[PDB]
Design a protein around this motif. Structure first.
Motif, PDB file in Angstrom:
ATOM      1  N   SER A 155       0.825  -1.204   0.000  1.00  0.00           N
ATOM      2  CA  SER A 155       0.000   0.000   0.000  1.00  0.00           C
ATOM      3  C   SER A 155       0.861   1.257   0.000  1.00  0.00           C
ATOM      4  O   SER A 155       0.562   2.222  -0.714  1.00  0.00           O
ATOM      5  N   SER A 156       1.935   1.263   0.793  1.00  0.00           N
ATOM      6  CA  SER A 156       2.867   2.385   0.763  1.00  0.00           C
ATOM      7  C   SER A 156       3.513   2.516  -0.610  1.00  0.00           C
ATOM      8  O   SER A 156       3.740   3.631  -1.093  1.00  0.00           O
ATOM      9  N   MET A 157       3.822   1.385  -1.249  1.00  0.00           N
ATOM     10  CA  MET A 157       4.363   1.425  -2.604  1.00  0.00           C
ATOM     11  C   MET A 157       3.380   2.062  -3.579  1.00  0.00           C
ATOM     12  O   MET A 157       3.765   2.909  -4.391  1.00  0.00           O
ATOM     13  N   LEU A 158       2.108   1.664  -3.513  1.00  0.00           N
ATOM     14  CA  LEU A 158       1.108   2.238  -4.409  1.00  0.00           C
ATOM     15  C   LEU A 158       0.933   3.728  -4.154  1.00  0.00           C
ATOM     16  O   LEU A 158       0.761   4.512  -5.094  1.00  0.00           O
ATOM     17  N   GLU A 159       0.969   4.138  -2.884  1.00  0.00           N
ATOM     18  CA  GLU A 159       0.881   5.558  -2.565  1.00  0.00           C
ATOM     19  C   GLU A 159       2.084   6.321  -3.110  1.00  0.00           C
ATOM     20  O   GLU A 159       1.947   7.452  -3.591  1.00  0.00           O
ATOM     21  N   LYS A 160       3.272   5.719  -3.042  1.00  0.00           N
ATOM     22  CA  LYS A 160       4.497   6.379  -3.486  1.00  0.00           C
ATOM     23  C   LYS A 160       4.781   6.116  -4.964  1.00  0.00           C
ATOM     24  O   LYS A 160       4.886   7.056  -5.758  1.00  0.00           O
ATOM     25  N   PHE A 161       4.908   4.847  -5.344  1.00  0.00           N
ATOM     26  CA  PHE A 161       5.242   4.488  -6.713  1.00  0.00           C
ATOM     27  C   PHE A 161       3.966   4.318  -7.535  1.00  0.00           C
ATOM     28  O   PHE A 161       2.861   4.640  -7.089  1.00  0.00           O
ATOM     29  N   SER A 162       4.109   3.801  -8.756  1.00  0.00           N
ATOM     30  CA  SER A 162       2.988   3.745  -9.688  1.00  0.00           C
ATOM     31  C   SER A 162       2.105   2.526  -9.441  1.00  0.00           C
ATOM     32  O   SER A 162       0.911   2.662  -9.149  1.00  0.00           O
ATOM     33  N   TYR A 163       2.672   1.327  -9.554  1.00  0.00           N
ATOM     34  CA  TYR A 163       1.869   0.113  -9.556  1.00  0.00           C
ATOM     35  C   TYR A 163       2.698  -1.052  -9.031  1.00  0.00           C
ATOM     36  O   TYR A 163       3.922  -0.969  -8.905  1.00  0.00           O
ATOM     37  N   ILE A 164       2.005  -2.146  -8.728  1.00  0.00           N
ATOM     38  CA  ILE A 164       2.625  -3.374  -8.235  1.00  0.00           C
ATOM     39  C   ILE A 164       3.443  -3.999  -9.358  1.00  0.00           C
ATOM     40  O   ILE A 164       2.892  -4.290 -10.429  1.00  0.00           O
ATOM     41  N   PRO A 165       4.742  -4.233  -9.170  1.00  0.00           N
ATOM     42  CA  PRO A 165       5.522  -4.890 -10.223  1.00  0.00           C
ATOM     43  C   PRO A 165       5.080  -6.332 -10.407  1.00  0.00           C
ATOM     44  O   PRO A 165       4.738  -7.024  -9.444  1.00  0.00           O
ATOM     45  N   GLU A 166       5.080  -6.779 -11.658  1.00  0.00           N
ATOM     46  CA  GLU A 166       4.727  -8.160 -11.949  1.00  0.00           C
ATOM     47  C   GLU A 166       5.797  -9.099 -11.408  1.00  0.00           C
ATOM     48  O   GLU A 166       6.992  -8.787 -11.434  1.00  0.00           O
ATOM     49  N   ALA A 167       5.362 -10.251 -10.908  1.00  0.00           N
ATOM     50  CA  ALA A 167       6.289 -11.225 -10.359  1.00  0.00           C
ATOM     51  C   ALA A 167       7.168 -11.810 -11.460  1.00  0.00           C
ATOM     52  O   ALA A 167       6.861 -11.722 -12.652  1.00  0.00           O
ATOM     53  N   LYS A 168       8.281 -12.407 -11.043  1.00  0.00           N
ATOM     54  CA  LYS A 168       9.194 -13.028 -11.991  1.00  0.00           C
ATOM     55  C   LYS A 168       8.505 -14.185 -12.706  1.00  0.00           C
ATOM     56  O   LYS A 168       7.574 -14.802 -12.183  1.00  0.00           O
ATOM     57  N   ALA A 169       8.965 -14.463 -13.929  1.00  0.00           N
ATOM     58  CA  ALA A 169       8.334 -15.496 -14.744  1.00  0.00           C
ATOM     59  C   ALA A 169       8.380 -16.853 -14.052  1.00  0.00           C
ATOM     60  O   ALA A 169       7.350 -17.519 -13.900  1.00  0.00           O
ATOM     61  N   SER A 170       9.564 -17.270 -13.613  1.00  0.00           N
ATOM     62  CA  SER A 170       9.743 -18.555 -12.942  1.00  0.00           C
ATOM     63  C   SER A 170      11.159 -18.608 -12.382  1.00  0.00           C
ATOM     64  O   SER A 170      11.946 -17.669 -12.536  1.00  0.00           O
ATOM     65  N   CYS A 171      11.472 -19.727 -11.723  1.00  0.00           N
ATOM     66  CA  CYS A 171      12.844 -19.985 -11.298  1.00  0.00           C
ATOM     67  C   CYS A 171      13.796 -20.074 -12.483  1.00  0.00           C
ATOM     68  O   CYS A 171      14.991 -19.791 -12.341  1.00  0.00           O
ATOM     69  N   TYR A 172      13.291 -20.454 -13.649  1.00  0.00           N
ATOM     70  CA  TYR A 172      14.112 -21.003 -14.715  1.00  0.00           C
ATOM     71  C   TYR A 172      14.104 -20.076 -15.926  1.00  0.00           C
ATOM     72  O   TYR A 172      13.540 -18.979 -15.904  1.00  0.00           O
ATOM     73  N   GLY A 173      14.747 -20.537 -16.998  1.00  0.00           N
ATOM     74  CA  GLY A 173      14.761 -19.849 -18.266  1.00  0.00           C
ATOM     75  C   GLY A 173      16.019 -19.054 -18.552  1.00  0.00           C
ATOM     76  O   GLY A 173      16.299 -18.776 -19.725  1.00  0.00           O
ATOM     77  N   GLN A 174      16.786 -18.698 -17.522  1.00  0.00           N
ATOM     78  CA  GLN A 174      18.015 -17.918 -17.675  1.00  0.00           C
ATOM     79  C   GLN A 174      17.748 -16.643 -18.479  1.00  0.00           C
ATOM     80  O   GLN A 174      18.239 -16.456 -19.595  1.00  0.00           O
ATOM     81  N   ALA A 175      16.927 -15.774 -17.894  1.00  0.00           N
ATOM     82  CA  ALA A 175      16.526 -14.548 -18.572  1.00  0.00           C
ATOM     83  C   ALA A 175      17.733 -13.659 -18.843  1.00  0.00           C
ATOM     84  O   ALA A 175      18.555 -13.415 -17.955  1.00  0.00           O
ATOM     85  N   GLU A 176      17.835 -13.175 -20.082  1.00  0.00           N
ATOM     86  CA  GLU A 176      18.939 -12.306 -20.493  1.00  0.00           C
ATOM     87  C   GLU A 176      18.559 -10.862 -20.173  1.00  0.00           C
ATOM     88  O   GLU A 176      18.171 -10.072 -21.036  1.00  0.00           O
ATOM     89  N   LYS A 177      18.683 -10.524 -18.892  1.00  0.00           N
ATOM     90  CA  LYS A 177      18.346  -9.213 -18.356  1.00  0.00           C
ATOM     91  C   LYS A 177      19.039  -9.068 -17.007  1.00  0.00           C
ATOM     92  O   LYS A 177      19.100 -10.040 -16.243  1.00  0.00           O
TER      93      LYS A 177
END
Lengths: 410, 410, 48, 48, 49
Positions: free
Chosen positions: B273-295
């Motif tokens: 709730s403090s995040m929503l009051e301060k920042f824009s929106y809830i960040p989406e959760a990570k895709a999964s444990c796996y995949g070795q995301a290039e980021k």
């Protein structure tokens, strides 16, 4: 009867030679019955992938100890941590091969991690020895704000407390800070000229460039650093005359694999000499109790001395490291690292090479330069310190006593 | 926006998933800009592979943005495993109960993992508050090489140096090894009759207490205050523990697990709730444990710096930078004459409330001498002879040349 | 202020004010003033 | 006593001496609420 | 003055229990040991321990 040993290694060729070393250790002093085995897995890019790999491949294979090493990729951001914490659940000892971070030295977090390579935080000992050799009593610490810098500072302060002395200033800078000129400007106003740096390669390069901008690399200054500050990019901007350190076999995965296999084989035989040994568990899933003989296996590992070692005499201290490593003192002369001495397990010995201190002078610079300008603090006490407003021009009137002598004012 | 929060407990706890879901049903607009749909799940036992699979299977399915994991066993290796699931998944994990609730010294800087526990610094603070209340200023601080000794000694020495109280720290015995052997007995002989701040594991402390009783270190005039490290499992009590052995520990009597899960959900909801009051929106959760995301795995906004200021309906549940509760629920328990850990005092909003205004003398053992040198003395205040004054504001105890004295006031 | 050990509000830390705070923090190198000699001052700084 | 008010300089050596002395605490409590910021101010207060 | 602190009588079992606890009550002071030579050797070995 068969004792399985797992090896988290970097390349297939290194795993083949790990198997060769296991065979060699099996040939010598096999205790007449035990025939060691060897299973090996290559490092995986993701930590979760490696955790599942060691659970499925190593843990399910009844491994007594696990050998872990850095991947061939230059990134070294705590790669062996998932190994030490998957095999640390069951108190299965983990063998580090090229891991020099000091975080693993804390046993409250890493329960069953033992490395062959002493971490960077032990380099501080060398500096104290230098502080004992060249008679430097005033030093300045330039440490990072992470765990490594704090550990190095704590170790150096513990060593200095035995001498009833302390560093004049311990400047802590956050990792990756681009601008560090404020801290170096603060250090310049001090008296000590013995600047000791403990930081990563990028931070070391930043500190070196900031010191070069501030004319801090000239004559009268002496720099003592570690292995991370004279390797890679930090070597590109390193000032001439710096006193670095290097490990004789720090990057030699070969000798480390061989000596670790020898030590673990001797420890396994010593453990099997004793009584009431339990067999290792099968698989991460389905078994939750710790390995009962885990603590005693780690204790027997920590009490085994490998006499004839490729990296030298292999020992273990209560913190879990080798405790006895050969540090080669490298001085940067003409933008080239030349050895001006070597630090054995307990002492530093110089050689025929001549140390060129920063600024090009050959004579050993003094520890500090005394300051002849003193910051004087006073208070307004009427009989002792009269204080009066000055005139517009900036100097107040000359006054004379009853005798007629001028009253000295500041 | 809907907040997905996961709760994970063991089967040893009778609380069902439906009860956990119903726990977040007070219906008083708990989340002003958001609603929480709690997802619950249990596991048979705690182990690396199954824990990882459960955590990111919940992440894949329910798109969770938090975790309120609660363990049942006393395995101290679960806390680390949770910490680095948080590190490699960026999900805010809360260690609620069991092994996950034991405080870990140093966490990963990039890991958003917080624990419902009290660090050794907080336990030492509570112990010193106990001593200040009971004026047990003289103390001999016994330690070992059981990890964390150095931090405990450093904090106690720093507090003593900063302390306004006498604190004649007589000695620091470090029983390196060979507890039942030579050169540790001679170390123990230098102990004088005083409070003993024993710091070690439970079984090792059993050994040291057997030795101490063999040396006559337990009695009416011998006081032992100890942290939660040695008290450990309250259910099982060694026969070597003297009665009156004061300890401090996280409360498992009044702080029920239902309240634990409710507090964790409230903390996560308030932070979001403090995040929503301060920042824009809830960040989406990570895709999964796996995949070795290039980021380079860097969320724009996280819950890490917004957990330092988290307030619930009636209590403050903020966290420090290192990951400890600013207001932990610590209780001071004692081993009474019935050989059971009886809770005595509590630690609320930086104040220690003790049930016993005067410490009731506890018979250490069956063969201990009777209580004779202790006497109750009546004394009524008369102007010139005996004077009753209040507590010193500067020292929060009795001033010099003055003795404690208790008045029963309605 | 001449200097006295005071407990700062945050973290309840002992601190020196005035001349002792100026000298022990490195802002000043010497105190030429009516500074009385006593234990609390002599434990941290040294008097001629 | 209320009618007889006496003081010293706040955060100074004499303040420490009165604080630490074993027996004069009863009047140290009285002086703590009347201490002056500087010696000149206390001298002026005595003068008028 | 002669502040006679204590009189330890090691009845038997010098290297065994309940005599160590007796010896622990000794404070740093002059010790007027009274026994045979070999028994005093035993008590002195214990005392050094």
């Amino acid at each position: 009867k068969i004792v399985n040993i797992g090896a988290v290694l970097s390349t297939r060729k290194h795993e083949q030679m790990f198997r060769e070393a296991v065979n060699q250790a099996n040939k010598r002093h096999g205790s007449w019955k035990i025939q060691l085995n060897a299973t090996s897995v290559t490092h995986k890019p993701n930590a979760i992938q490696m955790a599942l790999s060691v659970c499925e491949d190593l843990i399910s294979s009844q491994v007594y100890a696990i050998l872990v090493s850095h991947p061939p990729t230059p990134n070294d951001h705590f790669t062996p941590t998932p190994v030490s914490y998957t095999a640390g659940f069951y108190r299965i000892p983990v063998l580090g091969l090229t891991t020099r971070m000091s975080i693993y030295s804390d046993k409250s977090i890493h329960l069953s991690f033992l490395r062959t390579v002493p971490p960077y935080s032990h380099q501080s000992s060398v500096w104290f020895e230098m502080m004992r050799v060249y008679n430097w009593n005033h030093i300045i610490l330039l440490v990072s704000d992470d765990h490594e810098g704090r550990a190095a500072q704590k170790r150096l302060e513990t060593l200095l407390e035995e001498r009833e002395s302390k560093a004049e200033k311990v400047l802590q800078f956050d990792p990756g800070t681009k601008n560090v000129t404020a801290l170096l400007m603060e250090a310049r106003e001090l008296e000590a000229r013995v600047i000791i740096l403990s930081a990563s390669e990028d931070d070391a390069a930043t500190v070196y460039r900031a010191a070069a901008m501030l004319n801090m690399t000239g004559s009268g200054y002496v720099w003592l650093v570690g292995e991370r500050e004279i390797s890679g990019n930090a070597l590109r901007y390193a000032p001439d005359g710096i006193i670095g350190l290097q490990l004789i076999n720090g990057k030699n995965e070969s000798a480390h694999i061989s000596d670790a296999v020898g030590v673990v084989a001797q420890a396994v035989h010593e453990l099997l000499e004793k009584e009431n040994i339990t067999d290792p568990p099968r698989g991460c899933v389905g078994n939750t109790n710790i390995w009962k003989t885990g603590p005693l296996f780690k204790r027997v590992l920590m009490s085994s001395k490998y006499a004839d070692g490729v990296t030298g005499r292999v020992e273990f201290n209560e913190d879990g490291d080798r405790k006895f490593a050969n540090y080669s003192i490298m001085n940067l002369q003409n933008r080239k690292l030349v050895q001006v001495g070597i630090y054995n397990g307990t002492h530093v010995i110089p050689n025929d090479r001549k140390i060129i201190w920063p600024g090009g002078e050959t004579e050993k610079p003094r520890g500090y330069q005394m300051s002849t300008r003193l910051k004087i603090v006073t208070i307004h006490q009427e009989p002792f310190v009269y204080v009066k407003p000055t005139m517009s021009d900036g100097t107040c009137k000359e006054e004379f006593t009853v005798n007629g002598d001028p009253v000295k004012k500041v | 926006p809907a907040l997905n929060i996961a709760v994970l407990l063991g089967h040893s706890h009778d609380v069902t998933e439906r009860e956990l879901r119903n726990l977040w049903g007070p219906e008083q607009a708990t989340g002003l800009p958001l609603d929480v749909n709690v997802v619950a799940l249990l596991m048979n036992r705690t182990d690396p592979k199954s824990l990882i699979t459960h955590v990111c299977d919940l992440m894949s399915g329910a798109r969770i943005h938090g975790l309120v994991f609660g363990d049942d066993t006393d395995q101290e290796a679960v806390a680390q495993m949770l910490d680095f699931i948080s590190s490699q998944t960026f999900i805010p994990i809360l260690g609620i109960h069991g092994g996950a609730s034991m405080i870990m010294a140093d966490k990963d800087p990039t890991s958003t993992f917080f624990q419902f526990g009290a660090s050794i610094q907080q336990q030492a603070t509570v112990m010193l508050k106990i001593m200040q209340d009971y004026d047990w200023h003289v103390f001999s601080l016994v330690t070992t090489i059981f990890p964390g000794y150095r931090d405990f000694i450093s904090f106690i020495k720093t507090t003593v140096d900063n302390s306004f109280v006498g604190w004649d720290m007589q000695n620091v015995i470090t029983l390196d090894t060979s507890f039942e052997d030579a050169k540790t007995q001679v170390q123990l002989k230098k102990i004088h009759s005083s409070v003993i701040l024993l710091y070690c594991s439970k079984d090792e402390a059993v050994l040291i207490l057997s030795e101490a009783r063999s040396l006559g270190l337990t009695g009416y005039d011998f006081f032992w205050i100890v942290p939660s490290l040695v008290s450990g499992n309250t259910e099982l009590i060694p026969k070597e523990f003297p009665s009156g052995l004061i300890s401090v520990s996280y409360d498992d009597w009044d702080y029920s697990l239902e309240a634990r899960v409710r507090d964790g959900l409230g903390i996560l909801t308030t932070a979001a709730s403090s995040m929503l009051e301060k920042f824009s929106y809830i960040p989406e959760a990570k895709a999964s444990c796996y995949g070795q995301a290039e980021k380079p795995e860097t969320p724009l906004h996280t819950l890490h710096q917004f957990m330092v200021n988290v307030t619930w309906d009636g209590k403050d549940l903020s966290f420090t930078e290192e990951g400890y509760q600013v207001h932990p629920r610590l209780v001071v328990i004692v081993l009474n004459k019935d050989r059971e850990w009886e809770k005595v005092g509590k630690w609320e909003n930086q104040t220690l409330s003790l049930r016993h205004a005067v410490w009731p003398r506890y018979k250490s053992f069956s063969d201990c001498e009777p209580d004779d040198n202790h006497l109750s003395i009546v004394t009524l205040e008369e102007a010139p002879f005996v004077i009753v004054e209040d507590i010193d504001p500067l020292t929060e105890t009795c001033v010099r040349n003055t003795v404690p004295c208790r008045k029963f006031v309605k | 202020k001449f200097g006295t050990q005071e407990r700062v509000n945050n973290s309840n830390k002992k601190e020196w004010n005035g001349m002792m705070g100026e000298l022990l923090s490195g802002q000043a190198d010497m105190i030429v003033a009516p500074l009385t000699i006593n234990n609390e001052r002599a434990q941290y700084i040294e008097f001629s | 006593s209320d009618k007889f008010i006496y003081a010293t300089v706040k955060q100074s050596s004499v303040d420490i001496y009165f604080r630490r002395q074993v027996e004069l605490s009863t009047m140290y409590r009285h002086m703590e609420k009347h201490n002056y910021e500087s010696a000149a101010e206390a001298i002026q207060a005595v003068r008028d």
